[PDB]
Amino acid sequence: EEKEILWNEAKAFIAACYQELGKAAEVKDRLADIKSEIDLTGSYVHTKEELEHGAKMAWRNSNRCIGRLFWNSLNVIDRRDVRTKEEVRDALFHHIETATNNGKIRPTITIFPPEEKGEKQVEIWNHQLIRYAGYESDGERIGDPASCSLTAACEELGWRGERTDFDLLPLIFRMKGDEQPVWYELPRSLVIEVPITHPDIEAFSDLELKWYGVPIISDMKLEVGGIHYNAAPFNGWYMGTEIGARNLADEKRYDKLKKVASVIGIAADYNTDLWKDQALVELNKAVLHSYKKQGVSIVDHHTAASQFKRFEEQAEEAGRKLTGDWTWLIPPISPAATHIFHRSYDNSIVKPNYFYQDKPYE
Amino acid sequence: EEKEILWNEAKAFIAACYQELGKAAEVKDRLADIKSEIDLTGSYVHTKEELEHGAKMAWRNSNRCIGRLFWNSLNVIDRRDVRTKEEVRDALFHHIETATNNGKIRPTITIFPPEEKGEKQVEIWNHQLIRYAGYESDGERIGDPASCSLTAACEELGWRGERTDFDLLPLIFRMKGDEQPVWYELPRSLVIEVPITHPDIEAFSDLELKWYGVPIISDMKLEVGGIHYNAAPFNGWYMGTEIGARNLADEKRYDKLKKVASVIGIAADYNTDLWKDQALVELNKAVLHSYKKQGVSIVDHHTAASQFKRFEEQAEEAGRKLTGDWTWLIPPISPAATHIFHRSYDNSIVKPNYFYQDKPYE
Numbered sequence: 001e002e003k004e005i006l007w008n009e010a011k012a013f014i015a016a017c018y019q020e021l022g023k024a025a026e027v028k029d030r031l032a033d034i035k036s037e038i039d040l041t042g043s044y045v046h047t048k049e050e051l052e053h054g055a056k057m058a059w060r061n062s063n064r065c066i067g068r069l070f071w072n073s074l075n076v077i078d079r080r081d082v083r084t085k086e087e088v089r090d091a092l093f094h095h096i097e098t099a100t101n102n103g104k105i106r107p108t109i110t111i112f113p114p115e116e117k118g119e120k121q122v123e124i125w126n127h128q129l130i131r132y133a134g135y136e137s138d139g140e141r142i143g144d145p146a147s148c149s150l151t152a153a154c155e156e157l158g159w160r161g162e163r164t165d166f167d168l169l170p171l172i173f174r175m176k177g178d179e180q181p182v183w184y185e186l187p188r189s190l191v192i193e194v195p196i197t198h199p200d201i202e203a204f205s206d207l208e209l210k211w212y213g214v215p216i217i218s219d220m221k222l223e224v225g226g227i228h229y230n231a232a233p234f235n236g237w238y239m240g241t242e243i244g245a246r247n248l249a250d251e252k253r254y255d256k257l258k259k260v261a262s263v264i265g266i267a268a269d270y271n272t273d274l275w276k277d278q279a280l281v282e283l284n285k286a287v288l289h290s291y292k293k294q295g296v297s298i299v300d301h302h303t304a305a306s307q308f309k310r311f312e313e314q315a316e317e318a319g320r321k322l323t324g325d326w327t328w329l330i331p332p333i334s335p336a337a338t339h340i341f342h343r344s345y346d347n348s349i350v351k352p353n354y355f356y357q358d359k360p361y362e
Numbered sequence: 363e364e365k366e367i368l369w370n371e372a373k374a375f376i377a378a379c380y381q382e383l384g385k386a387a388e389v390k391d392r393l394a395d396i397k398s399e400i401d402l403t404g405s406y407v408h409t410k411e412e413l414e415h416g417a418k419m420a421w422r423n424s425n426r427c428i429g430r431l432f433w434n435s436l437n438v439i440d441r442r443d444v445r446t447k448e449e450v451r452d453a454l455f456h457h458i459e460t461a462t463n464n465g466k467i468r469p470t471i472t473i474f475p476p477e478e479k480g481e482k483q484v485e486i487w488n489h490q491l492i493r494y495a496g497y498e499s500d501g502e503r504i505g506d507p508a509s510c511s512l513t514a515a516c517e518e519l520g521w522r523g524e525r526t527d528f529d530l531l532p533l534i535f536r537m538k539g540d541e542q543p544v545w546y547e548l549p550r551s552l553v554i555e556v557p558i559t560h561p562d563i564e565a566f567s568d569l570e571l572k573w574y575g576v577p578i579i580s581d582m583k584l585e586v587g588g589i590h591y592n593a594a595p596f597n598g599w600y601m602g603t604e605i606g607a608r609n610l611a612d613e614k615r616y617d618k619l620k621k622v623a624s625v626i627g628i629a630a631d632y633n634t635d636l637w638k639d640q641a642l643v644e645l646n647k648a649v650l651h652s653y654k655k656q657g658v659s660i661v662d663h664h665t666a667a668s669q670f671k672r673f674e675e676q677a678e679e680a681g682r683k684l685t686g687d688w689t690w691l692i693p694p695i696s697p698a699a700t701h702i703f704h705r706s707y708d709n710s711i712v713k714p715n716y717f718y719q720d721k722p723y724e
């Protein structure tokens with residue numbers, strides 16, 4: 001039956017993919033070779049054209065993503081030829097460098113060898129290639145609490161953090177056959193960081209906040225026509241609210257809101273003063289200003305919502321059925337000031353797509 | 363079959379209601395009289411105790427309501443004895459007065475005679491008992507655009523608005539038998555209004571904004587044990603964001619955000635300045651401050667979220683299954699700063715409850 005499920009997903013993907021590429025005539029002969037290759041080897045290998053477009057369709061079908069307007073300009077890097085740890089590490093180093101692009105971030109995905117028969121060729125442990133470590137013992141909260149389990153796993157493998165609030169986690173991944181993953185420190189020259197300042201309030205610098213330039217999700221599975229690419233890290237650019245409203249604001253993250261209220265000169269005592277809402281706005285203004293001043297790509301949630309409406313229009317113009325997750329598409333700051341809040345979306349899962357998968361550390 | 367459906371809803375409501383009231387022993391004899399009364403008359407009449415508790419259960423089951431903690435203190439007024447237009451009008455005048463309570467708003471519901479066999483005894487046309495009219499001809503937008511259809515209907519019946527931005531709509535309702543509804547102007551002495559000022563910014567008064575004290579939803583159907591109370595207006599107090607983030611902020615409502623940005627001294631040119639978010643916060647701060655200064659009940663979305671968490675805890679403490687509509691429970695300002703944003707809710711419909719019904723004007 002395992003040879004059946006792949007043949008069904010391949011017949012659905014190839015037909016849809018070749019039709020969108022104007023290659024509908026080449027369809028039937030391609031699945032003939034596919035149906036053979038599956039019968040013989042138990043799987044099949046995508047063309048570079050199928051793999052590139054398949055990764056673009058997967059982004060187009062991500063119901064929770066507000067930045068899908070630019071799905072067709074995704075920069076796909078085919079690294080299915082990788083066999084060694086040094087090749088994985090260099091390919092990841094290269095992804096960071098080419099996606100960063102001196103600040104003018106290029107949406108990029110590096111695609112590693114897919115699973116054979118459920119057996120992963122490379123198993124990435126990082127949630128994002130660039131992320132800050134987190135520590136909790138004592139009653140000391142240091143760094144990013146969301147990275148607490150991964151940090152504890154890295155420190156069993158010989159790594160040790162300086163225990164600042166912004167320790168860069170190392171790359172950590174396991175190869176097929178090896179019992180334990182390897183880890184490699186990130187070269188600081190590859191990692192752009194943005195210090196958070198406010199355009200009007202000079203005291204905002206006293207918070208000594210910063211964030212990294214490029215969010216590179218590295219723990220999701222790309223599924224294209226039945227082929228399971230468990231290791232395929234991708235990146236866009238940040239929407240400001242992800243940093244200002246969640247990463248630096250959540251109580252279970254960096255929890256900076258009352259420190260923000262202090263440096264902007266308002267009290268944090270009464271709910272009716274809306275000090276949290278006011279602090280959230282000034283922190284988010286600071287994030288956008290700081291990324292723009294440094295020359296690192298970022299988008300505000302209003303512009304992003306406008307772009308997503310064009311994606312909604314482009315979808316209907318092309319006859320494509322639009323799918324979306326309202327609960328994730330609305331921004332966490334002023335959601336009712338976007339058109340997204342005032343309409344409905346079908347949360348149906350369409351393939352190709354990106355999916356969660358179990359963490360190897362827990 | 364119509365005699366069947368009511369017997370099923372009555373057996374479910376009476377059992378649940380009498381169990382919660384410690385009257386489980388009186389259950390079986392009460393439905394015996396009910397089963398007879400239905401066989402004879404085709405319907406049945408609730409006790410005052412069943413009607414009061416049934417209206418409280420309906421509030422407890424309103425998935426979209428964040429203020430459900432106080433469900434048990436609802437003030438129920440039984441007006442099933444009403445037969446004339448003057449009685450309806452006086453009962454509505456009384457509701458406004460007793461719910462307003464000089465500013466210390468009492469959550470109140472007035473319950474009118476229910477539908478017979480789908481035939482309404484009284485048909486309320488107001489969406490809320492106190493609401494502002496709206497006009498659109500010319501290209502003139504005057505008043506509340508959400509009230510445009512109702513205002514045009516009232517003006518066919520001999521009513522005429524002064525065409526200010528805050529014309530009080532008259533009470534308008536139709537009695538059984540009559541072809542057209544009657545309308546009665548609201549006595550200004552019954553209606554509390556709050557002028558919107560800012561605690562810090564004196565120029566905010568230049569906007570000349572105001573809102574009414576008490577939102578009294580008057581077009582929903584209360585369903586208790588199969589009995590359909592189509593006319594049963596109810597009120598709580600406002601959550602600040604309903605006025606500051608929607609009523610005065612939405613582009614299809616009063617659309618005041620760029621006027622707010624002007625009087626608070628910030629530019630409304632660049633999305634990355636987050637001027638809409640900043641204006642939303644200061645407008646919402648002004649709403650809360652203005653209601654508190656005048657002595658009219660209101661709650662901020664943070665306090666309301668805290669109260670709703672106690673309702674979640676009280677529900678589990680009592681063994682009640684909790685239901686809720688996440689998309690409506692999250693506030694439109696800083697939703698991720700509330701616990702509601704970070705959990706899930708079962709949107710199952712439980713009865714008794716309040717339901718939409720078709721407008722008679724359109």
Ligand code: HEC
Pocket residue numbers: 055058059062064065066067068070074107108109234235236237238239242299304328354
């Ligand atoms: C180009 C800039 C870009 C922006 C801005 C962007 N995305 Fe997404 N985006 C996703 C997926 C998948 C999710 C949902 C992940 C999840 O469920 O946790 C997502 C979720 C998001 C979220 C929600 C995050 C949150 O915490 O609520 C935001 C915001 C977002 N995308 C914005 C796939 C992508 C891919 C992959 C090819 C690219 C490139 C991409 N996205 C590019 C972008």
Ligand code: HEC
Pocket residue numbers: 417420421424426427428429430432436469470471596597598599600601604661666690716
């Ligand atoms: C005591 C103060 C109180 C507050 C604060 C309160 N409610 Fe609700 N509330 C509802 C219902 C029903 C809805 C959903 C109506 C709808 O679907 O449009 C609701 C919805 C709401 C909403 C959502 C409105 C929006 O536009 O998003 C808020 C906010 C709210 N309630 C707060 C029944 C009630 C009842 C009836 C007995 C009372 C009293 C009541 N509620 C009292 C309160």
Ligand SMILES: Nc1cccc(CNCCOc2cccc(OCc3ccc4ccc(N)nc4c3)c2)n1
Pocket residue numbers: 215217235236237238239242246327328703704705
């Ligand atoms: N309860 C709710 C309700 C509504 C919305 C949310 C949002 N959930 C909060 C963030 O928590 C997580 C947890 C796990 C994964 C995760 O992936 C974020 C992500 C993924 C891909 C991106 C691509 C580009 C980009 N710019 N950003 C991206 C962000 C977020 N939670």
Ligand SMILES: Nc1cccc(CNCCOc2cccc(OCc3ccc4ccc(N)nc4c3)c2)n1
Pocket residue numbers: 341342343577579597598599600601604608689690
């Ligand atoms: N797309 C979305 C997504 C999420 C949330 C919303 C919220 N929808 C906006 C408001 O639009 C309407 C339309 C029709 C009815 C209505 O009833 C408001 C109401 C009812 C009862 C109340 C009781 C007490 C109280 N204090 N307030 C109340 C408010 C709102 N829309």
Ligand SMILES: [Cl-]
Pocket residue numbers: 215242247
């Ligand atoms: Cl992030």
Ligand SMILES: [Cl-]
Pocket residue numbers: 577604609
């Ligand atoms: Cl309202």
